[PDB]
Structure 1
Amino acid sequence: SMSNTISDRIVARSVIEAARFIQSWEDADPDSLTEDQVLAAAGFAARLHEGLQATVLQRLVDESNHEEYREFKAWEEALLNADGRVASSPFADWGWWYRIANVMLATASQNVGVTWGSRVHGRLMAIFQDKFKQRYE
């Protein structure tokens, strides 16, 4: 398939934060971010986090849709590896926040055609470590 419906649904309910992040980080130097670039990244990640947590906890999914249900379960697995039911490692590779950083990279790719890499992604993860350590126990 050529779709990522869960990401589209969450980004589509996060457009103000998404636009603020993309526009703030346009020519950003991840090695020397401004306070406003940090805040725009944290604000978008927090909005994505809120929507994704709601989708997982409330089971906002069609379990009969083979693709959507599997992709939901990957988000659910990431949440369980953050909230202690399976593990308490929210910042592990390919875990909850790593996947949110990936959605933020996707947002830039699909809106303005820019492809960020490790320097941006690692800086996002460091911001999340600084700001969101208390979002899980």
Structure 2
Amino acid sequence: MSNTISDRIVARSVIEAARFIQSWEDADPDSLTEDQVLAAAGFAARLHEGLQATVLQRLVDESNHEEYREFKAWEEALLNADGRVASSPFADWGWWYRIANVMLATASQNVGVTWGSRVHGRLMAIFQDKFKQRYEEQ
């Protein structure tokens, strides 16, 4: 499972990526500051935008193959998020769940550290709070 697509979007979010990493690098999720939450939100939304663009605009060498599989996984998640096939953007292995995976991987490949399930949980909990009124109607 390649990460070419993920990398192109991260390489276009360096400011928001560094900001998230520095702000969280040694943090503990059970005691997060306003600014830590917001550092996570700002990165996830930046990734959201780039990846959504990637799927909608079909930015992918369909001839590649390992890349095309990666692309189809994102497409699947998008169509399960935006209402076109389903409406569960915060479901396990869906859109935001995959966005959090990209965020933990980016920290790892930058500063060596390994976040796990506890960080992922708090990210998902932030993404539901900050981003639920993007999909729903009150």
TM over 0.5: yes
How far has the Cα of 1:107 moved from its partner?
0.6
Higher mean C-alpha deviation, range 64-73 or range 47-56 = 64-73
**Alpha-carbon offset, residue 3 of structure 1:** 4.1
Kindly indicate whether residue 82 of structure 2 is the aligned counterpart of residue 83 of structure 1: yes
Q: Separation in 1 of the partners of 2:134 and 2:11? A: 23
Match of 1:40 in 2: 39
**Is residue 2:24 matched to residue 1:29?**
no
Q: Deviations over 1:61-103 (max 9, x none)?
A: 1111111111101000000000111110000001000000000
* Aligned mates of 1:110, 1:134 — CA distance in 2: 32
2:125 match: 126
Normalising by structure 1, we get a TM-score of: 0.96
How many angstroms apart in 1 are the aligned matches of 2:132 and 2:19? 23
CA RMSD, 1 decimal: 1.3
Deviation per residue, 1:99-126 (Å, 9 max, x gap):
0000000011000001001110000000
Tell me how far 1:40 sits from its aligned partner. Answer: 0.2
Q: Which moved more, 1:60-69 or 1:33-42?
A: 60-69
Query: What secondary structure does 1:132 align onto?
Result: helix
Q: Does the CA-based 8 Å contact 2:2-2:66 persist in structure 1? A: no
Counterparts of 2:56 and 2:133, CA distance in 1: 18
Where does the alignment leave 5 or more consecutive residues of structure 1 unmatched? none
Q: Residue 31 of structure 1 aligns to a residue in which SS?
A: helix
Measured in 2, the distance between the counterparts of 1:133 and 1:26 equals 26
**1:108 partnered with 2:107:** yes
Distance across 2 between alignment mates of 1:31 and 1:112: 22
Task: Name the SS of the counterpart of 2:29 in structure 1.
Answer: coil
**CA–CA separation in structure 2 for the residues paired with 1:101 and 1:135:** 17
The alpha carbon displacement at 1:55 in A equals 0.4
Identity, % of aligned pairs? 99
What is the distance in 2 between the residues matched to 1:134 and 1:51? 20
Would you identify which runs of 4 or more consecutive aligned residues in structure 1 move more than 6 Å?
Answer: none
